[PDB]
Amino acid sequence: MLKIIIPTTMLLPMTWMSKHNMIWINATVHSLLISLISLSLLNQLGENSLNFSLTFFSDSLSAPLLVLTTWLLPLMLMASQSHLSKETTTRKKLYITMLILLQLFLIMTFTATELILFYILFEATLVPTLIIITRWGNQTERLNAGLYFLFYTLAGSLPLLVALVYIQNTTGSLNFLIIHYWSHPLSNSWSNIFMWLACIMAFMVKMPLYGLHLWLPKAHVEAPIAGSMVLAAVLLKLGGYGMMRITTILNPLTNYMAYPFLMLSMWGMIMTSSICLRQTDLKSLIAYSSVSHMALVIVAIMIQTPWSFMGATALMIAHGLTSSMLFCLANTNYERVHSRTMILARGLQTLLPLMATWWLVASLTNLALPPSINLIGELFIITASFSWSNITIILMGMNMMITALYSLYMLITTQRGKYTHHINNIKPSFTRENALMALHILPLLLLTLNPKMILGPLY
Amino acid sequence: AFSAPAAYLTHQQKVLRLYKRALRHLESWCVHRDKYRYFACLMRARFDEHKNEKDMVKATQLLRQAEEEFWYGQHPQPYIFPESPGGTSYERYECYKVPEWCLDDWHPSEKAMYPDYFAKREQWKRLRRESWEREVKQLQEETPPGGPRTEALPPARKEGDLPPLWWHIVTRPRERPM
Amino acid sequence: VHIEPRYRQFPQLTRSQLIQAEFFSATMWFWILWRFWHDSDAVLGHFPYPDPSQWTDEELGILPDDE
Amino acid sequence: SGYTPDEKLRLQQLRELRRRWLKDQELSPREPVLPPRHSIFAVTHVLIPVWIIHYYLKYHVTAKPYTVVERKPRIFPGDTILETGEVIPLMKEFPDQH
Amino acid sequence: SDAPPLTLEAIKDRVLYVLKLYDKIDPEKLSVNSHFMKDLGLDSLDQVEIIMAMEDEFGFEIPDIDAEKLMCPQEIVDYIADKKDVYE
Amino acid sequence: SKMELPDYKQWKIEGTPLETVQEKLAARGLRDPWGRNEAWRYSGGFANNVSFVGALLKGFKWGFAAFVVAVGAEYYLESQ
Amino acid sequence: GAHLARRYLGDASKEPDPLRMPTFPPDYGFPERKEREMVATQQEMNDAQLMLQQRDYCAHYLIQLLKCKRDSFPNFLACKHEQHDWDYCEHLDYVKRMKEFERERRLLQRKKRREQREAEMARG
Amino acid sequence: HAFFKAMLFMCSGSIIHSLNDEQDIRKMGGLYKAMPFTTTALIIGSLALTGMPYLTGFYSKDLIIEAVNMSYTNAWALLMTLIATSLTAAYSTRIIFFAFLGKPRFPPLV
Amino acid sequence: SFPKYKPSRLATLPATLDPAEYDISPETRKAQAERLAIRSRLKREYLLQYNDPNRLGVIEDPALIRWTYARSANIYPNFRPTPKTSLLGALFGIGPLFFWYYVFKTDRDKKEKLIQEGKLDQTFNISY
Ligand SMILES: CCCCCCCCCCCCCCCCC[C@@H](O)O[C@H](CO[C@H](O)CCCCCCCCCCCCCCC)COP(=O)(O)OCC[N+](C)(C)C
Numbered sequence A: 001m002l003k004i005i006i007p008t009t010m011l012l013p014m015t016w017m018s019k020h021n022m023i024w025i026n027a028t029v030h031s032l033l034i035s036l037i038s039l040s041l042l043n044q045l046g047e048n049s050l051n052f053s054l055t056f057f058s059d060s061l062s063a064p065l066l067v068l069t070t071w072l073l074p075l076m077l078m079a080s081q082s083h084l085s086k087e088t089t090t091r092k093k094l095y096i097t098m099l100i101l102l103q104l105f106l107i108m109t110f111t112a113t114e115l116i117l118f119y120i121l122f123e124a125t126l127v128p129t130l131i132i133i134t135r136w137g138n139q140t141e142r143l144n145a146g147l148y149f150l151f152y153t154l155a156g157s158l159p160l161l162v163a164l165v166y167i168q169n170t171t172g173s174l175n176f177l178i179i180h181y182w183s184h185p186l187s188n189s190w191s192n193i194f195m196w197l198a199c200i201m202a203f204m205v206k207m208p209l210y211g212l213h214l215w216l217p218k219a220h221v222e223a224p225i226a227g228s229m230v231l232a233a234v235l236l237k238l239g240g241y242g243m244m245r246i247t248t249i250l251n252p253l254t255n256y257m258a259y260p261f262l263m264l265s266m267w268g269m270i271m272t273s274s275i276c277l278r279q280t281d282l283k284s285l286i287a288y289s290s291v292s293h294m295a296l297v298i299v300a301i302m303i304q305t306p307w308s309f310m311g312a313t314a315l316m317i318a319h320g321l322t323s324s325m326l327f328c329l330a331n332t333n334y335e336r337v338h339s340r341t342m343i344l345a346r347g348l349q350t351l352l353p354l355m356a357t358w359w360l361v362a363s364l365t366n367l368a369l370p371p372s373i374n375l376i377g378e379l380f381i382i383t384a385s386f387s388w389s390n391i392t393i394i395l396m397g398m399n400m401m402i403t404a405l406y407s408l409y410m411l412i413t414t415q416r417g418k419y420t421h422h423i424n425n426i427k428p429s430f431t432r433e434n435a436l437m438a439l440h441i442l443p444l445l446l447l448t449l450n451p452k453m454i455l456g457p458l459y
Numbered sequence B: 001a002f003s004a005p006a007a008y009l010t011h012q013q014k015v016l017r018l019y020k021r022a023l024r025h026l027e028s029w030c031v032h033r034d035k036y037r038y039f040a041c042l043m044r045a046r047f048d049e050h051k052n053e054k055d056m057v058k059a060t061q062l063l064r065q066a067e068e069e070f071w072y073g074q075h076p077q078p079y080i081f082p083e084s085p086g087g088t089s090y091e092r093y094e095c096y097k098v099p100e101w102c103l104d105d106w107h108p109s110e111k112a113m114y115p116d117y118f119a120k121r122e123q124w125k126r127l128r129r130e131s132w133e134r135e136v137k138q139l140q141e142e143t144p145p146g147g148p149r150t151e152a153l154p155p156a157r158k159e160g161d162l163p164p165l166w167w168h169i170v171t172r173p174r175e176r177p178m
Numbered sequence C: 001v002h003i004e005p006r007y008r009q010f011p012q013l014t015r016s017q018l019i020q021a022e023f024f025s026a027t028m029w030f031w032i033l034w035r036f037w038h039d040s041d042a043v044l045g046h047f048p049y050p051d052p053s054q055w056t057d058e059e060l061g062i063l064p065d066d067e
Numbered sequence D: 001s002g003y004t005p006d007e008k009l010r011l012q013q014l015r016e017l018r019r020r021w022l023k024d025q026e027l028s029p030r031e032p033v034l035p036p037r038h039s040i041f042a043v044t045h046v047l048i049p050v051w052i053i054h055y056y057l058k059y060h061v062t063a064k065p066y067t068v069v070e071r072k073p074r075i076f077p078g079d080t081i082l083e084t085g086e087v088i089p090l091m092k093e094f095p096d097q098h
Numbered sequence E: 001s002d003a004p005p006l007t008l009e010a011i012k013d014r015v016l017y018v019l020k021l022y023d024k025i026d027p028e029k030l031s032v033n034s035h036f037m038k039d040l041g042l043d044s045l046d047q048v049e050i051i052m053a054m055e056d057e058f059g060f061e062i063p064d065i066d067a068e069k070l071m072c073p074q075e076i077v078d079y080i081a082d083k084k085d086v087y088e
Numbered sequence F: 001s002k003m004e005l006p007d008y009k010q011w012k013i014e015g016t017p018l019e020t021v022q023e024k025l026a027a028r029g030l031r032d033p034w035g036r037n038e039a040w041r042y043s044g045g046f047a048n049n050v051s052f053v054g055a056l057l058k059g060f061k062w063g064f065a066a067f068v069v070a071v072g073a074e075y076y077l078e079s080q
Numbered sequence G: 001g002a003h004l005a006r007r008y009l010g011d012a013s014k015e016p017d018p019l020r021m022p023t024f025p026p027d028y029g030f031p032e033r034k035e036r037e038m039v040a041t042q043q044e045m046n047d048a049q050l051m052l053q054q055r056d057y058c059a060h061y062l063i064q065l066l067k068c069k070r071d072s073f074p075n076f077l078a079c080k081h082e083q084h085d086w087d088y089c090e091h092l093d094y095v096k097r098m099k100e101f102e103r104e105r106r107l108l109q110r111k112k113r114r115e116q117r118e119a120e121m122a123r124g
Numbered sequence H: 001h002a003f004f005k006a007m008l009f010m011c012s013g014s015i016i017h018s019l020n021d022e023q024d025i026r027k028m029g030g031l032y033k034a035m036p037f038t039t040t041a042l043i044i045g046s047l048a049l050t051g052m053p054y055l056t057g058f059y060s061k062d063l064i065i066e067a068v069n070m071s072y073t074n075a076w077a078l079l080m081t082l083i084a085t086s087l088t089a090a091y092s093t094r095i096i097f098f099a100f101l102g103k104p105r106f107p108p109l110v
Numbered sequence I: 001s002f003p004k005y006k007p008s009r010l011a012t013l014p015a016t017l018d019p020a021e022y023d024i025s026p027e028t029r030k031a032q033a034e035r036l037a038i039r040s041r042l043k044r045e046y047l048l049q050y051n052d053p054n055r056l057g058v059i060e061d062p063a064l065i066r067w068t069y070a071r072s073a074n075i076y077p078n079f080r081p082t083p084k085t086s087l088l089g090a091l092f093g094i095g096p097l098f099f100w101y102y103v104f105k106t107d108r109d110k111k112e113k114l115i116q117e118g119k120l121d122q123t124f125n126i127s128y
């Protein structure tokens, strides 16, 4: 699959050899071309994966994620060139280099056949993200956010490494195919319980799980717009992909080791949906929305059924697109008024009608309106949970109401009412921002047209 | 809405407000015109019976009983004018009110239409720009040294002055803008 | 059709609206009368409701309190 | 009671300015300078859609089993079948409670 | 269409019409600039009743703080004109 | 277009319930100074209005005449 | 309904119970009873697809009414004889049901009174 | 129900539009003669809503009531249905009486 | 004389029913004067920038900034572990989790016990 990896490593020197005023054009054009190339991975089989070599393979679960990453890179490039206009040429090239390196690490992570290689790449993704957050963030909290982003990850991932090597000294292989075929049940002992915890906690903290999520609001609020985009749409799905991969060796311990995490996921989904109802920061509201959706995904992965896995895959794809769109929509208003408070700029539908339409579509998709893929994933997960236990329909149902409320709340706070009188610097929407919104929203409904592409291997 | 409020309401002001509220709610109770006129005359006589009370304490005590009686006997669903703060059309047209500064961002193709309107707009903007320094100086002169004590603003007194802080009052969007 | 305000007088009425209103009221009443003349059973009932107490024991088959 | 002279004078001046501003909102006769068959509805909105729909249902939808399922027609005594020609017997010699 | 574009002359005519139906004022003695307490000898209750009559006639409410200040028919006409964006 | 208000002295409370209100207020020593302002709602073409039963049976006469004609024709059309 | 007042306020011991009814043998009071017959075949009602609730003892009149309705389609006011026949059949069915209700009430009250009288006679 | 409910709402909207977007029946005077066609339509719709015989509302509401009368059903539900079908005529009478009969109560600019 | 109206949290007392505004004394009038003076000074400070022809952007309001900072960043530095805080945190953060765990564990145990005995009527239950 080097036909995708090599063009990114070629994006690197092309950016570093570009003329000072042509970096954005070249980067965007060739990133779009790389996305078009990566579109060919959607042609999957029904029985096994695409085993390209001893190192890399593609599956029906990782191909949509790869397509989403390669599609997200150009969107980040367009969203970044506004607030980086005054930067020097060298620092702009460094920023683009960080973005390209992040894409390369994510591409190699989603296709690694080996669990230690997966760990190495899934840990290497931290350095570009941390550098971006702590160098190009705007306020003084960013430094603290970086620390919160770093150690929260590492404290979860360092035990996993130990567990991984332990497994390789017992079974002799960490290759995913051999691991799947030579799978054996896990007994009920304290050592197996702690091995389960070591294998699970890293991906549960990257989701993030409720109670372990405190890093996410900081990281997604103090980051630049591209950083928030990549953190919310792709980097949160590393936990889901890793859990879906690693759960093949944890049965039947999961059958009873999932209870605390299931309880945390459901109650914290309710809790974060409620938190969204009282939020003075517009970016924090989107961050907590991400927390709630990822709690739903955690439940789906933890109950371990084919319908749950299908719904979880669809929900990850839909959430990535939707949250990236919401972050960009909030960043437009921030760039206009230089403040993140939701009740500062009001009645924006009067001043920006097409932006109000984009806001309406994003909010309608966030609350899982049929037949959007958000709804497909949510409904599949809810049906699987109902099969798991009939009482869950209470909590899930509760969430379905609360989400809608806060979603429309945001819209009604930002677009309706009367405009603030003293704010007179609201210029007409640029073609770049409208194109960004359209390129976010059109793929969502296009995938709604053909939903089996994002339903995962269990389809 | 146009007048600057005071630090407090006088006794006479409170009595007048209670009289108006009682009349309106009684009209809400008495739908027909002749019945309303009858009971409004009765209410007027009831009000002017105690008009000549020299004891202020007893006057405010009578007002207290009047407010208690009104709150007990108020109409639960009083008539509200459609554009009043409780009416069915209170803020119906606020979505059509667009601030004037938006016109500063129109494309030159849009400004190619309506040339004379934009010429008049340029004249108004120039007048505001010339006027601003004087408006600030007048407010500086007329202000007591311990800051303003009310929200009232002075008029223009000089030969060709303009009343200070006039731009956003004069250029209100409209009552029926679109 | 131009109709101007009146300020405390009865509004101006065109003949067409009065003709339409009277015609439709008349057609409603004619329809009601015609349908009642032809479908009285729909309102007054069609079959006589029998009372039970005038049914003899012979057709109801109850014994004379002896066996 | 009433206004004080300052409020009256300020209201007069603001009123003059506001009436001037509202007079300026008017349009001169040239302001909108614009820069430089009968039954066709029944054809483009009924005939064309029904042609496409009929073609799609006749040659694509009904090319698969159970795509357009129609409930069985009601058969009454004394009827004759179109294909088999079978006639249905009558109904058991009504007691005739006339 | 909708209601005609109310003018200053129409507003003044309507206000004077309403005032001339009041039994406590003499129609001959009443003028556009006549004061309610000074020239006409009314008290505050009569002024409240006059404001309520104007509210009924034009179909919109005048706040008490603003209604306390209108003392002559010209002031009432001016307040109505500024409220309804009438300039001719 | 270009219409003036009717003359103000044609409005009188005589012959209206406002007269009854004035008489009842006179017996208590009171007075109603606003009756002429309300007289227009009773003076002109609003002088009289139907009752509820009169309103419900709006077009009963014409419809009943038509019904009688139709039934008479039916009675002499079955004689064919 | 008056029967409701009789059952709920008066002695409910002698009043028929709609849920549990009839409580006497069908041949108890009558010397012999005729078996109620049907005119419509099961296949006939199946072909007509009436309802599971319209396949009562008056189904033949309903079938004839539906057939005449279909045959006289544009003239939707021509099948009045058939509708009248169906209505008369259902009216007779309801009359039969009321007769059963009264038979049960009379049997209940007579049986209980006779049992009380026999018990009193055996108690003296 | 669709027919007469929609046309009753259309008549109410016509009244509202004529009287300068006024919706309160207390300020709606005598419109029986001022709005002849609207009065005719509203009267016919009110009679249809109350199940006056041989109108559109008769053929459904009459059968519904006579069917709840003949069923093994909750007694409280039957009583509440009867009281509600009385209150229906009650509020239709309220609308007609307050909106069309009597003397005008709207602002003098007609 | 008439039935009395007693206020609540979600239905507060009207101004005209307030005894406190019907017995006034000069220091109350002085306090109202200073309140109006503060309001007028803030209004003038706002309106001077609002009408400035050279002002482009957002008029910064320290009240909004203070409100958001108090709601977001000032909370932890002013936190003390007290019996009230500890008890409320333990309750609201632990009780719901164990309640839902008990409910779902009981339901799933009952369902599994029904499955083992072979009496749950799982016919047509293909998709899970
Ligand atoms: C802030 C959010 C962070 C994320 C939270 C992650 C949740 C992690 C919780 C771990 C889940 C379960 C752990 C162990 C499994 C069973 C737990 C125990 O209570 O069950 C009984 C265990 O019995 C007793 O409970 C003994 C354990 C008591 C000591 C454990 C300390 C618990 C204190 C809780 C502290 C909070 C931990 C989290 C710190 C952050 C079962 O009886 P037993 O059959 O014998 O043990 C089964 C194992 N066998 C088969 C080998 C024998």
Ligand SMILES: CCCCCCCCCCCC(=O)SCCNC(=O)CCNC(=O)[C@H](O)C(C)(C)COP(=O)(O)O
Pocket (backbone or CB within 6 Å): B011, B012, B015, B016, B022, B025, B026, B046, B047, B048, B049, B050, B051, B052, B053, B059, B062, B063, B066, B069, B070, B071, B073, B074, E043, E044, E045, E046
């Ligand atoms: C609908 C159900 C609610 C019914 C509520 C109504 C019932 C309450 C009616 C009785 C209440 C009273 O009269 S309370 C009587 C209060 N007593 C006084 O006011 C004595 C001092 N006089 C003055 O203040 C002025 O002369 C003034 C009177 C304001 C005139 O103002 P002007 O001359 O300068 O216009």
